[PDB]
Amino acid sequence: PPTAFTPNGTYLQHLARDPTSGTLYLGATNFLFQLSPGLQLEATVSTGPVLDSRDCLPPVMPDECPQAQPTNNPNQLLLVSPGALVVCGSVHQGVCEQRRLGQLEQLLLRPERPGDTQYVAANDPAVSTVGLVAQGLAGEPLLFVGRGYTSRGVGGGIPPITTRALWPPDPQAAFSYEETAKLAVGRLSEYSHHFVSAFARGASAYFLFLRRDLQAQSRAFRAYVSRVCLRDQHYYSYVELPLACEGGRYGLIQAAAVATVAHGEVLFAAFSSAAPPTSGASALCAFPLDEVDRLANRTRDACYTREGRAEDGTEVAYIEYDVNSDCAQLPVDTLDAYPCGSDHTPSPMASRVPLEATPILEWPGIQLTAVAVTMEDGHTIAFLGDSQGQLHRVYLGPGSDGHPYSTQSIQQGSAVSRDLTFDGTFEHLYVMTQSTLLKVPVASCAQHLDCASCLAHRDPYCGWCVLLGRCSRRSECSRPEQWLWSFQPELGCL
Amino acid sequence: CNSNVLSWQTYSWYC
Ligand SMILES: *[C@@H]1O[C@H](CO)[C@@H](O)[C@H](O)[C@H]1NC(C)=O
């Protein structure tokens, strides 16, 4: 019976894990929870309901907002920074606050009179907000925010990607962005950015998102990964790469994870063939971050020094979003001197060449909504959640077709959140639907005390250590002694 | 909701 947290009278939205302590933070409707690694409740903070209107500006009080009605507050963004928990709700134009780590109840910073540059998150629960935290070139913490388009109420003018200050000189300016700390993009309602994930590696921040390809008469949504330098607060280095899972046949990216050969990080992302109704199939596609960086680097080098062309002459780079910019023919010393650009280099760059992947696996009738990937004995294992509330486990090593070896219902009819995360040791996985959070062990080998039940509950982690009389992992079969893999059906007990 | 819904998690949870 797995450990669970099922809060009554609320729905869940986001899960954030502190990598230094393991403490879990749970964003819910009108609630924030602080949980131990074993899902014990350490604090409960009420965030709503509040008086609000999407046509009113915070702080919302009756005199200046006569149309205000009581409004519930689904969490829109939940992120651990080195010194604080960043929290942005759906109410009050998506304004944010900072709370103390390990004492959620204590507020650290909440601007008293926030202005137009401090409306961070989408004010609509159905529009996603993604974020990531990073240290900036002045030593201070930065918050990258990808925010989708909102139509209803003031706040359709917020830039789709922004870089905001978490601890600026004046605390009251917290969460605001400088004038150039944004992706300057018009026709926001037409592109209609839908953000799926944001992550960092090395000196780069990455965004995964959907947006309309306005150069196609279909005006159809396409999946993109964009890279921007992680610390400068500028978008000079922004480069946009289209993603192609089976040529774009699986077009609507849903969820992703990064997993770890040096700098061998790979992005695993799930893609749906069909959009949700106003049938279909899902695929898992792998994009090694080194390949992501080479294409981004090649896009930049072509735009900077070869008028957007590769060394063979091919047009590979161009300027997006109808910005008055063009690629250039700068001296080649530019590439080592300004890897992240300047306020005069061509921007915002995009690649004509999509990043392509052949699906790891293709499942009909399943809409994958969550991805987490780990390794065991050098071989990839994927944990995948779907729109019906099921968690699937898939061995991706030699001998597999990509079909899951285990499928369990977390909650029937409630999609698994893309906020799937492992614990520090990769021994447990935290899985969340709209109403429940579970701590799931990645393997339960020890539960089997005879060889037959060990080998019968087929699991890539589990095998019978002969000279130990235990169902264990291969790493645990040593005092490397004989280990009967439960994932070798042609091999049985002795 | 809206026809702007491309996420199946969003559809499951809010539509
Ligand atoms: C991309 O370029 C940067 C510097 O411009 C370099 O440090 C990095 O290793 C390159 N990445 C790849 C994958 O070639």
Side-chain angles (χ1 to χ4, degrees), chain A residues 12 192 194 221 254 272 274-277 367 413 415 418 434, chain B:
Chain A
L12 308 179
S192 200
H194 286 75
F221 284 92
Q254 299 293 306
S272 284
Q367 309 299 332
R418 60 184 76 85
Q434 202 184 17
Chain B
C1 285
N2 208 5
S3 67
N4 225 36
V5 181
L6 312 172
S7 161
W8 286 88
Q9 179 191 322
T10 294
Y11 179 77
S12 174
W13 286 12
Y14 307 111
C15 307

Side-chain angles (χ1 to χ4, degrees), chain A residues 325-359:
Chain A
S325 192
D326 70 287
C327 292
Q329 203 176 351
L330 303 167
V332 299
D333 52 48
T334 298
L335 306 176
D336 323 282
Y338 313 91
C340 292
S342 81
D343 61 353
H344 292 104
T345 52
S347 181
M349 299 180 271
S351 182
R352 300 281 189 203
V353 176
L355 203 63
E356 305 162 27
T358 301

Side-chain angles (χ1 to χ4, degrees), chain A residues 213-231:
Chain A
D213 186 7
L214 297 189
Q215 292 303 337
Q217 183 182 334
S218 48
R219 271 176 154 241
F221 284 92
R222 186 132 79 123
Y224 294 89
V225 58
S226 64
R227 191 189 66 178
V228 69
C229 286
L230 186 65
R231 323 204 175 275

Side-chain angles (χ1 to χ4, degrees), chain A residues 114-261:
Chain A
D116 50 6
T117 56
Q118 292 167 294
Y119 306 149
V120 175
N123 58 357
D124 187 339
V127 181
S128 294
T129 308
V130 302
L132 83 90
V133 178
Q135 188 192 165
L137 293 182
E140 274 321 86
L142 296 178
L143 173 68
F144 288 82
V145 175
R147 180 202 197 273
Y149 177 73
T150 59
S151 147
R152 321 173 201 173
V154 202
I158 292 138
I161 315 189
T162 48
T163 306
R164 309 167 172 270
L166 294 167
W167 279 93
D170 179 23
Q172 293 299 324
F175 304 104
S176 69
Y177 59 97
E178 283 162 23
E179 37 172 52
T180 48
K182 62 176 185 186
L183 177 67
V185 160
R187 313 166 72 184
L188 291 191
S189 57
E190 302 176 43
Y191 291 107
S192 200
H193 294 82
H194 286 75
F195 281 91
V196 161
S197 196
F199 61 98
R201 179 186 86 155
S204 302
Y206 302 83
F207 299 86
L208 297 165
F209 63 91
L210 285 154
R211 76 165 171 83
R212 283 202 174 96
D213 186 7
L214 297 189
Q215 292 303 337
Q217 183 182 334
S218 48
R219 271 176 154 241
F221 284 92
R222 186 132 79 123
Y224 294 89
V225 58
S226 64
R227 191 189 66 178
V228 69
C229 286
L230 186 65
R231 323 204 175 275
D232 62 340
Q233 294 190 41
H234 293 279
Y235 281 76
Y236 310 143
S237 52
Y238 185 90
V239 43
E240 198 163 282
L241 312 181
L243 291 172
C245 192
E246 205 179 57
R249 271 145 155 90
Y250 297 94
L252 301 187
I253 184 168
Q254 299 293 306
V258 177
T260 162
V261 172

Side-chain angles (χ1 to χ4, degrees), chain A residues 265-351:
Chain A
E265 288 93 1
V266 173
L267 173 78
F268 296 82
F271 293 79
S272 284
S273 72
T278 55
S279 297
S282 280
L284 187 70
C285 265
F287 305 92
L289 284 193
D290 278 351
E291 285 185 18
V292 173
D293 279 346
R294 276 185 282 273
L295 187 55
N297 277 6
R298 270 137 83 131
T299 305
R300 169 199 64 201
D301 301 354
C303 201
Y304 279 16
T305 61
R306 295 182 306 261
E307 304 279 3
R309 293 152 178 256
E311 319 225 13
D312 60 0
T314 301
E315 307 263 15
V316 300
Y318 72 110
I319 299 307
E320 260 290 357
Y321 298 117
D322 276 302
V323 172
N324 189 351
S325 192
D326 70 287
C327 292
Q329 203 176 351
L330 303 167
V332 299
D333 52 48
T334 298
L335 306 176
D336 323 282
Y338 313 91
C340 292
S342 81
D343 61 353
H344 292 104
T345 52
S347 181
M349 299 180 271
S351 182

